[PDB]
Amino acid sequence: NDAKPCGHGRMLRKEDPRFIRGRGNYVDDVKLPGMLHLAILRSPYAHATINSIDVTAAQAHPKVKAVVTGADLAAKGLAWMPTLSNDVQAVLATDKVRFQGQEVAFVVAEDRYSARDALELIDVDYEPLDPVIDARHALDPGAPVIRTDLDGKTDNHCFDWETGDAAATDAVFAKADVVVKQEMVYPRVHPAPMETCGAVADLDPVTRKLTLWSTTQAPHAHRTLYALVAGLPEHKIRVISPDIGGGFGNKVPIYPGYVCAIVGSLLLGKPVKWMEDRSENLTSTGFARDYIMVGEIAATRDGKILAIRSNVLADHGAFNGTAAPVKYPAGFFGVFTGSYDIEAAYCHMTAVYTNKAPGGVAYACSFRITEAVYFVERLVDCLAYELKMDPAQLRLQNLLKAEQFPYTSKTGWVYDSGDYEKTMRLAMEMVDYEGLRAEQAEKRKRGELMGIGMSFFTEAVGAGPRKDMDILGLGMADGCELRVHPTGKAVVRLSVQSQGQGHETTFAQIVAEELGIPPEDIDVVHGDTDQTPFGLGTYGSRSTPVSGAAAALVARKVRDKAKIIAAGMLEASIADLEWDKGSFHIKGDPSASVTIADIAMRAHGAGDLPEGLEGGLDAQICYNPSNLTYPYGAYFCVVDIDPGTAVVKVRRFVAVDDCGTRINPMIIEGQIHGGLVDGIGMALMEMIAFDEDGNCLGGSLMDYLIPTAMEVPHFETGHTVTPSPHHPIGAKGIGESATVGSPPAVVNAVVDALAPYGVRHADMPLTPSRVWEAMQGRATPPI
């Protein structure tokens, strides 16, 4: 990794020197003069009218500088704020609390400890209501109406969505030899980044400039949304997304706490820091998943998948906070047809409200693609089970062929490129699929439970063409600026915001590749909206498909302009100039060459530049994707299940990913490995559960179990390179791929291990108890 390529390839990350020394600058590190600390009193009830709020005792606390309630915000018109799904969501609960852990009031105090004490001092009179916790009964007649805030709302129905052709799918199913129906749940889980959400809002009382240090993955989106929501002038808003301690989609939304910090600063004319505790994070910020999916797969008796039908009941929490493009309320779930050549596909999805925190799009879901991929890969393993055919053989026969691309799926998605069989076979060879099968058979002879699970998935990442994909009206096209300093060092300003994905390295490499400036000579700037171009931020693995493409293209613009300047300098025709990785030289005379540094100096230097050319070596671009990128993966999990305790151990995980051109293989490996750990966590232990009373049972890291290093194997990864044709450097997103593909691989592995017990499906989390219940023939969804 200590190589120093001028461009793509392995290289040490440029963020590491500071992180390894504890010199990262995360939001909670931000100490500003006079900074106050904000703590948010959370609802103890899942569903309760707020009769009254008494804040006199908290206000009387000698260290408490302000106590703010939903009434106070409503006076300022900030009691509600739009969600990313065009819903509204309480900033502070005013009429009722619609989920436990929901924001009810906040206290600004001299220090965090005093702020929490003061919260204890606040007295809220609740009238508890019946909670809507079971998403299956949310639409039942007489279910309490959560969204009484909405005029005329009489049910907990959030939205109806559909994709594909119902009639074509019905006809195919009528003619199908084999129809396999399986209900599967994708239980509510949480991104749970190690750094919780937080914001230091410093509204300078004189200049009126809001400087908002925030754990935001989309600082520009957030800046624009703050301007729109708080009425603050956008040119007087500087959202600083500092080093982020992991986002995983958790830091995409604007949370009520950010607004509350802004209000606290406004009120007090002081910096106000709100750092959420873990319990607030788990119970109030964006959950992920929480789908109940009835899949039906129609095939021929030989295993040609004909049609796939999905009926999704989506649990969206109290408010539809799903961070999805406007035209895609169900996100990219339409890719549920997967990597397979099928005749027809239909999905109908019902999103319902429940007394739980909003969210759903988070945790490396790629806009519900985790749900679609788990749906389809689990369903395909169910189909294999029914056909009594090797799941790998099933998949391999149904996989889309390379010549089919660009492939328009039955749900309208145009897959950019892919050689699925090659990647799948690579994964099978690497994992030694047949050898694993022999060993598993021998173990079953011995009574031991060995599962081989697999998933083949097509991601759809890089949102996206503005014509289709916009976040709250913001086209998902990314700006990128490149500036070559006179001395030949460069600065690339991105609209993407790393939360650990290595952007400061990889974008340096993209530019280095295009321009010949060494990556160490390229400062990658990001997260500070005052010095970065507008863009949609980092989520949906879009940084490389969108901002990466933009960076490559802007570097090329700078190279073209540099060619003009260099042709002037070499006193040569522009046609006689050859680009040589960092330098232009006259054809046939390499010695008649000028480096990008020489050209940069000249571009700022004395003497007239070529006619019609402006000085400097700056370029900018707003890259609008033509299409998403469709990286894909062939994941193979090997699990052992203790037959006595039903404890599942992941013995192996081979992940073969194809994300097109690879900018940085070490960073890519890290991204996959992290995704594999996420999948194991979801497949085996992670879940935010609620009791019948609506109490969040996963409000802490004691109850929301994230895999430790001991739960996960030494990961093995392979890759194939099938570049995206429409991408300037052929790179596809990878960030969420492993998280998308691994859950179905792990669940398939556990179900395969449970084969001796006649288990065709068991739902995650596959905890020891739930796996044992599946062994008993009593497999039931956790919800």
């Binding site: 020394r21 990262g24 750094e195 490996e669 802490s700 290093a709």
Partner: protein, 153 residues
């Protein structure tokens, strides 16, 4: 209350409330923001510091309790402008992405390498099993610790 302790080899004395958790005393009072916190239930391990040579969840220790003890953080790991082998291994092996767990992880890894010069992958996993990394998948962390162990050798 007054507390006196050695933080990264420097004696420090401060007026702290008895209830002040050590992580907050380090980060907020002493400005040693290398040490992180990520949970309320002593679960995540991002607060791990070295108290008397042993990894300790600074979130589960009062500053008042640390009084009279030596507390070492990631800030003290680089000695005389020289990275500790754990730090260098973490950089070389991509043992961090967002870096939030990294201070605690490297404190734990350095303690382990002190007590075990040549740890197996299992011993590394076990030693860090109290510390959550959301980003890396832990394989690169094991590789980082192996790298530090092998270079220290």
């Amino acid at each position: 209350m007054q507390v006196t302790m050695t933080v990264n080899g420097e004696a420090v004395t401060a007026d702290v409330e008895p209830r002040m958790l050590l992580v907050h005393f380090l980060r907020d009072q002493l400005g040693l923001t290398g040490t992180h916190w990520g949970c309320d239930t002593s679960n995540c391990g991002t607060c791990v510091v070295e108290v008397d040579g042993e990894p300790v969840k600074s979130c589960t220790m009062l500053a008042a309790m640390a009084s009279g003890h030596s507390v070492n953080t990631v800030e003290g790991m680089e000695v005389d402008g020289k990275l500790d082998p754990v730090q260098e291994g973490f950089m070389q092996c991509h043992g961090l992405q967002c870096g939030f767990c990294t201070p605690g992880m490297m404190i734990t890894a350095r303690a382990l390498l002190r007590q075990n010069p040549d740890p197996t992958e299992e011993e590394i996993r076990e030693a860090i099993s109290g510390q959550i990394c959301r980003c890396t998948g832990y394989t690169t962390i094991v590789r980082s610790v192996q790298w530090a162990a092998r270079h220290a050798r």
